[PDB]
């Protein structure tokens, strides 16, 4: 009866969302401090054999929001402060002999939660390390002065309040004022009068401002001295060396622009980012930055910028007399869009990619030898004119490491597909032309990936041929005829208005840019492309391919048979046509009713059935279908030109997101209200609602642990297990399911399956994360060892509690209190532990710390 | 309690109220990387293009008063 | 109003007492009385009046003008009546007024500083502290320029005290403005040929910036050591005492890092050791002393080995400030990487060992403790063998502070490393020397039990060859006619008792715990503490069931003790109680242990925190003992017979039975007599329900519901107080049982604990609001925010006053959380409402 | 109604408390479990106020603490919680 889980990560999330380079370990070696999510990790790069290695790994419980190094002076090893979801900063230093993250400083400051006002989101350090800077997204701010003491042991003093009201914060970092009073640049907009005025003229009359925070330290308080409104909305900011070697002032990154700005009397140098010859990209859209790395050296400086387009640029600002006249920018090589860089010394690159692998790249030729031009502010241009750009292969870098990331994982099935004994993990995930479908093993997890065009939204398997039918849809995307139109256009306005241009454009043409590489074209609003494919699992083959309209989109998939027909198959695909995202707007939608040949290898058009809304769930029903469109359930039979409803319900909340049928009990999923139970009256063809939930949720997966039990996962990282009540008859209504579990992952979960991944063994609840992890929920055999590792969470929460300041309890009771969940990843830190407190807390259980060692190793033995 | 930014009285008005939430909402977003990471899933933007389309609509996510 | 005046205010506020009108009063006269009546206001004023009078003073300090303001607040700054809080408010009314004047000060700027710098030399730390701030403040009000051109005359100022004082200041103004501002000038001043005492004031400016600043001072160490290092070769002597003084305090403030700075300050120390003599000499090896941490392993054995002739030979010097320059020095060198153990052994030890180790070194107290932390940290890196055998047999002097010396020099050494570097010689001088200190103390001292404890402690299973000697002494001093003596004896047994049961002599133990039983009726307290505490350690390692004498005839013999006043012997004999009732339970009746329970349910209302803490554990320990019938009913009828206070510990009686003892026992009969209409008894129930929840926390995840109905009753209004603690119950229930799904049980309470909240009286409606903030955090705040919304917006102001008070509550508790429960709020025709974001689907 | 709580930005200072208020909670005066340890800002711990009580003001003797029901409700995490009457100066007794 009782439901009690056990919670366990199989595969880390292998996403970053921020890196860091240093000397942390306090040799002459480089290591790399990264932030996985709720996982902070060590990597050391072998500069001789040009690979990464991981050396700590570390579960913080916790939401990181921003990462940051830092140096005392004279210092030998870089500390490292982290920004979390707590009311609290955390300063951290890792002892290498221990091989842990020892916790230096830890001060309390607010309460916990991504809050709007709780300082967190947003880290700057001054560059001497003499002073740090926490500070949420509005209003408040804080300010912590660093020292040493005689024993050379780093200590914190108390906070030094910056706040101010009615005020945005887009981006903090330290000045280089040298060994000037510390000073920190802000992006900020104030909010007051735009919410004053009725007309909306405020809204647009409000401009984004470059304050600077100034630390007097022989006053010791914080005071706003300077703020300079900018013409170009900027989306973060660059700090340049400053003091001994360059100037202090920042750049600020906008939307087509780069401005160095500096307090004083320098003159604001912007320069416009380059663009790209002939860009297949929608001429409204902009271009911005997404990341920046600084490398310095005794000699020069350089920074490296890479666009939305993944194209990095090097920037060289040239100084006369204490003054910046130029900033120059030259093209660098391109690679995938990456949320952070690292300009390693002993001559290497890291990318950490923002969705899926991350590379290694060594560097080869700084790029200032090759004849390729280069940009400055100072040459003329006007104003609708730019500079234009065409991409080349990799020239100045060389790929000496791929490190496999599973994120985003948008969806898995567990199965055996090869005949084998122990199934495999079928992983659709990637983003993009990045996008793959890999098969995992175990015998740590073994991948193997199969690249898809775009990305993948779901697949299903055919029961006799054991072959996948995935979707691939984008947004924001052009298919195969349109890239070709495209092209073709351009190069047809491109004669018009010399004619060695016929040539030119000819070689446009010919050429092909890799999209993995250099990107996908991305155009339009509500441009989608949509691709049906089938594909083996055991080899990376494709047996069919099927491309969708320009405006067609594919959010729902199923393979099934017809009573209406035989034993021969069928392949339903449900597409919406003129999707706008925000505000929301669609024409309708199409079900594409194929028949699929050839034992599960080529799909035989049938016909394409008109629908009101998107078909977003589509489920076999018992030689017949089951297909949600927008806030209808309908039941479909096969027809000779049409699918046609037999029977409809209209009484669902808002949106059908996902449906699942056990005999006549169906499970529709809505998009915040959770879980409405209908019952299809085979006599009288009705479909009756006969349930629902007393809580909002926002269903993202389900999975159906028996007749009465339903597990789901939140878009906010939750996961639910909701039980209706015994005694429940199908045509009496207004029966509301009890929530018999709830737990918080901190990862998103996009697939719930039940399954034994080990032949024999036992039975468990594998979920996936869209940042790339994946878990197991095992149940408890004996409530005596329910009570024991009951007991060793209590213990591990107060004896070894979150490295980020953040309550383990508070922490995995997010947006609903626990309940029936044990966290095993928490509990596995037992051996992490000192050995006094092992002991302890062994004495306290009443038996040996390598008994609780063996007791737990058990677990991860029976999944 | 009037100081935090959120908190209302028996005068808050629709706006108001609704101004705060999509407020929150948007931190929220931003500080939670599963979220972000599934609305830049959505539409096929960077994940930098979504934080700085996200504070873009903090002026005035709800409309004019 | 007008606040109270103190006699000495009259002086400085005699005018405000007259009654006359503004338009008589001259324009200047306004001004000054302006600035009394706000400065009364601030001194002697409520917090209001004085932030009042802070934010007018501040926002008219430009209006008003230095001139009259500081004319009026020096005065104040000088009377010998000046309380330290009147001192902080007017330092800090100094620095908001003066970061108003930037340059408005620069005339008053001497007028200032003869009025503060007086302070930086006061014995007072915050009155250093305020000093420093106020002129910090001015040099930033005031330029950089003219402070320099205010204090530069006063440089070569005939009386060195105020030179010191011109140095300290500017040393303040150098950490206000900065090291780099003050640099050409101090380059300047340090080679001025105008003046020997110019160049010692700007050394004596360097030597104080250190100390001031300490490790901020690695950036500018270089420029500084640079500036300064002429004074080491300089013709006057004075100058080369303090340029080596200002080198000394530069190393102090830049440990551990920055040798490479002081690269050329090397030879000329160790020339000038050579050559220099007395003062002078002293100066630069304390300067080396502090310089030598600093440096490579390789380079450091060098230049100890260099300077470590002349060291040895001022060893014997008849200056005692160069006696405890030399001690500091070798401390220095013998804790760093690179100065090897033997030679320290060989060249070191020998002479420092004859001429320090004298007894007239015992007699004052900065050398004792100098010369002890010395040869501790000699020991860490020679060896504690090597340290102690030197002084062991001195242990058995007749100068009683010399053997304390040592006593305390070989309890931390043996403290700190143990006892597995001693042969067997050497603990027989050991045990010997230590038997003597014991023996023969003229004066009760602390550090001879420490000591004796520590090495008995640390030799371990070693010292059973010498345990029937040291008892025969302990039982010898247990008959005396001083108590101390006997207080020592008990607190050595009670610190010994565990090696001793490593030594198997249980023998011995037993006749020590059999002489403890007779002592008990003592008569001086602390005595009697000592001895108890001594009596519960042997009962602790000899078991209850071999002690003597055996429990059934000591717990009687405790069972009067508990109505002794002492603190001591309460704590002492209620740990000694409780641990007989822990583990040796069995030999004692029912009966005794009730009345012990008895006379120990008042010791529940203690003062100190410790007594209250083991009367709960000595309590729990004998509720687990008996079962919970008996006391469970007589704490039910002290309940009813008494009234407010002393019910309170019949409470926490009843919630300690509870813990012990499942809840399944107490709480029938507790809710059984809520039964009767007694009113004031119901009352009793719901505290005693109140304090049982919060008491057992997680213990009451099974016993929710079981109460249910008794709260729904008291819910109703029964009283109204009645109302008041049953909401109490539930918010201690919502805190204990969270996180173990209860949210069943808890949801439905939560409708009978709402109506409630329409309540206008304080106490209840904060006692509602703290119920259900418990009650939000063990259900989530989805159901409040569902709760709230029904009546965020409503026609009745009251409604939407009362459920804002509540939405607020939830908001701040769970801001973040809400995220994920807000309702679909559709767009209208102005405004876009709908969160379009949440809505996508993959 | 003349007492309040300061409420300032606490900083490293360390709560401290007297023999009569030693194992009572900041915040709600409870005795039961002492969970986190109390902060309060520089300028209640500075001068006269340096180890003074944090509930009445006397001499200290052991740390103040929280208790575990307001920490678990993050009432550990609101403003410096040192009691200050409004109806006396700095210098009344
Ligand atoms: C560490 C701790 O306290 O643990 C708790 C669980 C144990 C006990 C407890 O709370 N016990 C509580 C706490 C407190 C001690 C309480 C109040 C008693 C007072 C104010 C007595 C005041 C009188 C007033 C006058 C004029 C003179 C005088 O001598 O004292 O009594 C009650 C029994
Ligand atoms: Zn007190
Ligand atoms: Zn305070
Ligand atoms: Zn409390």
Known sequence: ?863 | QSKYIGTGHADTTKWEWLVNQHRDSYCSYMGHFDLLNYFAIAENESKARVRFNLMEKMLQPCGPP | NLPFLKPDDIQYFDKLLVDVDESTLSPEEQKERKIMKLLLKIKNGTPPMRKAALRQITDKAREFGAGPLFNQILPLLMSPTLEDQERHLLVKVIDRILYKLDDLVRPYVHKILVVIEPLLIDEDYYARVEGREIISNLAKAAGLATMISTMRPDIDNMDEYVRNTTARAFAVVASALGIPSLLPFLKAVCKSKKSWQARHTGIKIVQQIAILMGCAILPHLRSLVEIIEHGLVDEQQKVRTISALAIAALAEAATPYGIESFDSVLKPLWKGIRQHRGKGLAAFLKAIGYLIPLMDAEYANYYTREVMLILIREFQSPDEEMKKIVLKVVKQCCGTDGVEANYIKTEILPPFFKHFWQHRMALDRRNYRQLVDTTVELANKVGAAEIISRIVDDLKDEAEQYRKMVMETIEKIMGNLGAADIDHKLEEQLIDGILYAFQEQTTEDSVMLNGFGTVVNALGKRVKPYLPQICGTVLWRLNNKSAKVRQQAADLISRTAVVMKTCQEEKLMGHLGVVLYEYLGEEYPEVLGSILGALKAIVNVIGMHKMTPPIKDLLPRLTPILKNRHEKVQENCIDLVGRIADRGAEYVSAREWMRICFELLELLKAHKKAIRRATVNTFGYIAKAIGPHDVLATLLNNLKVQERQNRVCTTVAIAIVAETCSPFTVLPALMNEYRVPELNVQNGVLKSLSFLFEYIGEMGKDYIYAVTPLLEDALMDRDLVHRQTASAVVQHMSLGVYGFGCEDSLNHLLNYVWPNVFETSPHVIQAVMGALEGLRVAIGPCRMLQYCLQGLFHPARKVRDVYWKIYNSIYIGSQDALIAHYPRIYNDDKNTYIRYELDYIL | PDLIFCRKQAGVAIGRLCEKCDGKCVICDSYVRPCTLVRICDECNYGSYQGRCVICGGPGVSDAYYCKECTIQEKDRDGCPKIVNLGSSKTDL
């Open chain 1, 1 to 863: 009866r009782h439901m009690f889980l056990y919670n366990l990560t199989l595969q880390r999330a292998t996403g970053i969302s921020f890196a860091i380079h240093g000397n942390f370990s306090g040799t002459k070696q480089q290591e790399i401090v990264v932030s996985r999510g709720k996982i902070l990790e060590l990597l050391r790069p072998d500069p001789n054999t040009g690979k990464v290695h991981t050396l700590l790994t570390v579960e913080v419980f916790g939401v990181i929001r921003s990462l940051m190094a830092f140096r005392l002076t004279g210092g030998t090893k870089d500390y490292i402060v982290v920004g979390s979801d707590s009311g609290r900063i955390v300063i951290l230093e890792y002892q290498p002999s221990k091989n842990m993250f020892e916790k230096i400083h830890q001060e309390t400051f607010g309460k916990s939660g991504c809050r709007r006002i709780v300082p967190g989101q947003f880290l700057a350090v001054d560059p001497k390390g003499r002073a740090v800077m926490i500070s949420a997204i509005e209003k408040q701010k804080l300010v912590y002065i660093l020292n040493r003491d005689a024993a050379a042991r780093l200590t914190i003093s108390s906070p030094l309040e910056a706040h101010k009201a009615n005020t945005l914060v887009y981006h903090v970092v330290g000045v280089d004022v040298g060994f000037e009073n510390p000073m920190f640049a802000c992006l900020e907009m104030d909010y007051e009068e735009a919410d004053n005025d009725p007309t909306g003229e405020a809204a647009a009359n409000t401009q984004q401002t470059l304050t600077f925070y100034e630390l007097d330290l022989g006053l010791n308080h914080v005071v706003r001295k300077y703020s300079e409104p900018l013409e170009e909305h900027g989306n973060f900011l660059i700090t340049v060396p400053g003091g001994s070697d360059g100037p202090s002032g920042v750049l600020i990154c906008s939307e087509n622009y780069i401005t160095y700005k500096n307090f004083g009397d320098q003159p604001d140098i912007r320069c416009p980012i380059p663009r790209r010859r002939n860009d297949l990209d929608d001429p409204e859209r902009g271009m911005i930055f997404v990341c920046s790395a600084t490398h310095k050296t005794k000699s020069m400086f350089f920074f490296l910028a890479q666009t939305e387009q993944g194209d990095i640029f090097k920037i060289t600002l040239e100084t006369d007399e204490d003054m910046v006249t130029e900033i120059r920018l030259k093209y660098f090589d391109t690679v995938p869009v990456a949320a952070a860089m690292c300009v390693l010394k002993t001559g290497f690159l890291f990318v950490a990619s923002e969705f899926g692998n991350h590379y290694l790249y060594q560097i080869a030729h700084l790029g200032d030898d090759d004849e390729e031009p280069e940009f400055s502010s100072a040459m003329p241009l006007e104003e609708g004119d730019t500079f234009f750009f065409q991409p080349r292969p990799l020239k100045n870098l060389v790929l000496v490491d791929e490190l496999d990331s599973l994120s985003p994982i948008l969806f898995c099935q567990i199965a055996d597909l090869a005949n084998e004994d122990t199934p495999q993990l079928y992983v659709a995930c990637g983003r993009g032309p990045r996008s793959s479908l890999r098969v995992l093993r175990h015998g740590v997890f073994n991948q193997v990936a199969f690249p898809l065009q775009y990305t993948p939204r779901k697949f299903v398997i055919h029961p006799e041929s054991n072959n996948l039918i995935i979707i691939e849809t984008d947004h924001n995307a052009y298919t195969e005829a349109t890239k070709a139109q495209r092209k073709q256009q351009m190069a047809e306005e491109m004669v018009e208005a010399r004619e060695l241009a016929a040539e030119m454009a000819a070689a446009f043409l010919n050429e092909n840019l890799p999209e993995s590489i250099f990107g996908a074209p991305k155009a339009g609003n509500g441009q989608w492309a949509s691709v049906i494919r089938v594909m083996n699992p055991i080899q990376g083959n494709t047996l069919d391919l099927v491309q969708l309209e320009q405006n067609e989109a594919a959010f729902s998939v199923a393979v099934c048979r017809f009573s209406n027909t035989g034993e021969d198959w069928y392949v339903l695909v449900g597409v919406a046509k003129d999707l706008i995202l925000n505000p929301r707007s669609v024409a309708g939608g199409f079900v594409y009713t194929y028949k699929l040949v050839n034992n599960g290898e080529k799909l035989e058009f049938l016909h394409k059935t008109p629908v009101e809304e998107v078909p977003a769930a589509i489920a076999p029903f018992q030689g017949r279908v089951l297909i949600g469109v927008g806030k209808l359930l309908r039941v479909y039979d096969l027809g000779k030109k049409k699918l046609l409803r037999k029977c409809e319900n209209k009484h669902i909340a808002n949106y059908i997101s996902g449906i699942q049928t056990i005999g006549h009990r169906v499970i529709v999923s809505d998009v915040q209200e959770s879980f409405i139970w209908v019952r299809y009256k085979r006599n009288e063809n009705q479909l009756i609602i006969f349930a629902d939930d007393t809580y909002p949720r926002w269903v993202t997966t389900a999975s159906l642990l028996d007749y009465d039990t339903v597990a789901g996962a939140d878009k906010f990282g939750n996961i639910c297990v909701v039980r209706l009540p015994p005694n429940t008859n199908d045509e009496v209504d207004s029966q509301k399911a009890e929530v018999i579990m709830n737990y918080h992952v901190g990862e998103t979960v996009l697939s719930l399956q039940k399954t034994t991944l080990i032949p024999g063994g036992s039975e468990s609840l594998v979920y996936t994360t869209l940042s790339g992890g994946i878990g197991i929920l095992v149940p408890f055999t004996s409530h005596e060892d329910h009570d024991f590792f009951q007991h060793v969470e209590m213990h591990l929460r107060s004896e070894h509690p979150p490295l980020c300041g953040r309550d383990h309890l508070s922490f995995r009771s997010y947006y609903f209190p626990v309940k029936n969940v044990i966290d095993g990843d928490l509990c596995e830190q037992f051996n992490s532990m000192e050995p006094n407190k092992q002991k302890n807390v062994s004495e306290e259980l009443d038996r040996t710390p390598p008994e609780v060692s063996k007791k737990l190793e058990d677990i991860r033995t029976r999944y």
